[PDB]
Amino acid sequence: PQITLWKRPLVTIRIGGQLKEALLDTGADDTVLEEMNLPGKWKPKMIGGIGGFIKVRQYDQIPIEICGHKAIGTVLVGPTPVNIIGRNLLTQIGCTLNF
């Protein structure tokens, strides 16, 4: 589909048995999800934005469905107010910017 930017580009994502709304975010290198207790190994990381940094947990090779498109990759879990689909997964679902 084509998503205009009159409103926030929120879409439905699925990560295991959880459905969540998330931003398709071209300004995000990495995918950052709200606090959730995913299985498996992880490593701590800091990521920076407006207002400074948050601590996140980096999980690798996590499958996520984004509008029925399959993705799998690194997901950072931490105290974000919004779920953020970053470029690492946007490319996998064939997402481009156009003007």
Added chain:
Amino acid sequence: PQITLWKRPLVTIRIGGQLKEALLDTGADDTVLEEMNLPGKWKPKMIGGIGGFIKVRQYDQIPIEICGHKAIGTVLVGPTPVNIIGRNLLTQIGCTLNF
């Protein structure tokens, strides 16, 4: 143009006769630029981000040419980690997400 997301969508902008690099940021409501001088009246504002809240200066009806496309709108100036073009100006230049 069409822009893929294997790299950061950085573009050259022209503002006040100055060329800067800025990130096309679909996850940002508002355009926020690093400290710079702009003429005219501004209003103090506070905005949120992943790391907390910051103080910015709000300038209205500022011309910016983004990758050759003309916008005239609100520019927030403050301690953003990088220059970001938000949805307020992305809509003006006709930017959409497609997959």
